[PDB]
Design a protein around this nucleic acid. Structure first.
Ligand code: XG4
Ligand code: MG
Ligand code: MG
Length: 430
DNA sequence: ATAATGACGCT
DNA sequence: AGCGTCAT
């Protein structure tokens, strides 16, 4: 109608590093480049757990969380890089540092929200606005968009992928309304031009390739990112949403991958995101709550308002290690020693954070899991973090959890702990 | 024995 | 405060 908002107010990108840990190891070791390759944690149990996979290895069926011994059965030529181990635990510093390389480059173009170690959202709205004045209503050349797919195009009236890519791009650019500096489709297009530029800059300055989604919000941007991978970017326009959503499994949409997604499917008897449009906002709210219902009602029409938060730095700093199976910690001395290994890594990172980013954590969260409980955390307790000292932090953590030891003999520890987790939080400016 | 983290909602 | 969800 004449008053309906169409969720076309922003230009948002989601940039995701293609098999990131593998790229970091391949940059460092040229012998691993353009080879079936994976990154592995902990060599000893079944060759190690695989945590990142090159696209050459994926084609053999190698996946994350697969044991390396098992992936070698699928892919005998598979090359492996091992994650650094410090103080008896996986240490991800190399990938954190590579990540900062990428996020600093992206920060030159626009406002970014760090989403994970290898993903960031980009609010390109302002950047596009200014680019559109620089562009005298000039046509946008296909040459400015050499790795961009236009989702849903080509339509109607070739046999190779790049064939199809440029046909869709041509149909899109031929149709564009470049006189109108307010057309959402033009804005997205200009957004796509800037993300090409950002991705060229990242590759030139780090050697890392990545993929991107460009759309009007974060959920659509994230979804778009995954449509054409690797080293490609996808524009998802508002107009493309009805066809895209009509066969889009509900669980593919960000935040609908877990329990809420499954109950949407089971309570409503539907499979695809677009089927949600039949329901009133009140019906949706009555099944899933006021906030979830409102969000679904707007999302299945391609509309979502979660802002890109200007936050390039993590809000918590944490250290964690699982002790599965027979390795579960069963004695007081073990528990203490590992709390100390965690606290030491933590102090390193905290101190580094206090020098690099001018801030100071003030609360220490202590999380454990007990044997048999399959919840992530069996128990969470906090205490003050007054001093970046590894021995104080570990002793404090021991203190606030020790009474979970139900054992009679207190040389031993029951029930066995299957996880330790130290998280520094509640940062103050320093 | 699908890790090591991280952000946020509910009460 | 502490637990639950969702995610890479
Ligand atoms: N230990 C562990 N690390 C993981 C896992 N999954 C991801 N990581 C670590 C390692 C990853 O390199 C990195 C990024 O995660 P993604 O973006 O979800 N996948 P990637 O970047 O590998 O490939 P692409 O994006 O092209 O699909 O975070 C896992 O299951 N376990
Ligand atoms: Mg990635
Ligand atoms: Mg990612």
């Amino acid at each position: 109608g004449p008053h309906m908002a169409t969720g076309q107010d922003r230009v948002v990108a989601l940039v995701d590093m293609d098999c990131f840990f593998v790229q970091v190891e391949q940059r460092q070791n040229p012998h691993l480049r353009n080879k079936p390759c994976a990154v592995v944690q902990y060599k000893s149990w079944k060759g190690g757990g695989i945590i990142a996979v090159s696209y050459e290895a994926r084609a053999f069926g190698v996946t994350r969380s697969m044991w390396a011994d098992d992936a070698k059965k699928l892919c005998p030529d598979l090359l492996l890089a091992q994650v650094r181990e410090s103080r008896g635990k996986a240490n991800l510093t190399k990938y954190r540092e590579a990540s900062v390389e990428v996020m600093e480059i992206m920060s030159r173009f626009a406002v970014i929200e760090r989403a994970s170690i290898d993903e960031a959202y980009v609010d390109l709205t302002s950047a596009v606005q200014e680019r559109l004045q620089k562009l005298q209503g000039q046509p946008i050349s296909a040459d400015l968009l050499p790795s961009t797919y236009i989702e849903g195009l080509p339509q109607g009236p070739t046999v190779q992928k790049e064939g199809m890519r440029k046909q869709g791009l041509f149909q899109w650019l031929d149709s564009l309304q470049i006189d109108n500096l307010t057309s959402p489709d033009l804005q997205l297009t200009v957004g796509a031009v800037i993300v090409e530029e950002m991705r060229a800059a990242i590759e030139r300055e780090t050697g890392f390739q990545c993929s991107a989604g460009i759309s009007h919000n974060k959920v659509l941007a994230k979804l778009a990112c995954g449509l054409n991978k690797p080293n490609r970017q996808t524009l998802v326009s508002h107009g493309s949403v009805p066809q895209l959503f009509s066969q889009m499994p509900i669980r593919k949409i960000r935040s609908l991958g877990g329990k809420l997604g499954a109950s949407v499917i089971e309570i409503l008897g539907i499979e695809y995101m677009g089927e949600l449009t039949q329901f009133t906002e009140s019906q949706l709210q009555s099944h899933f709550g006021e906030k979830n219902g409102s969000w679904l009602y707007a999302m299945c029409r391609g509309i979502e308002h979660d802002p890109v938060k200007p936050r390039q730095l993590p809000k918590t700093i944490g250290c964690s290690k699982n002790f599965p199976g027979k390795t579960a910690l069963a004695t007081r001395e073990q528990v203490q020693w590992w709390l100390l290994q965690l606290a030491q890594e933590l102090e390193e990172r905290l101190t580094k954070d206090r020098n690099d980013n001018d801030r100071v954590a003030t609360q220490l969260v202590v999380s454990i899991r007990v044997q048999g409980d399959k919840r992530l955390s069996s128990l969470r307790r906090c205490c003050a973090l007054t001093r970046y000292d590894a021995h104080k932090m570990s002793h404090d953590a021991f203190t606030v959890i020790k009474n979970c030891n139900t054992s009679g003999i207190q040389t031993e520890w029951s029930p066995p702990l299957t996880m330790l987790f130290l998280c520094a939080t509640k940062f103050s400016a320093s």
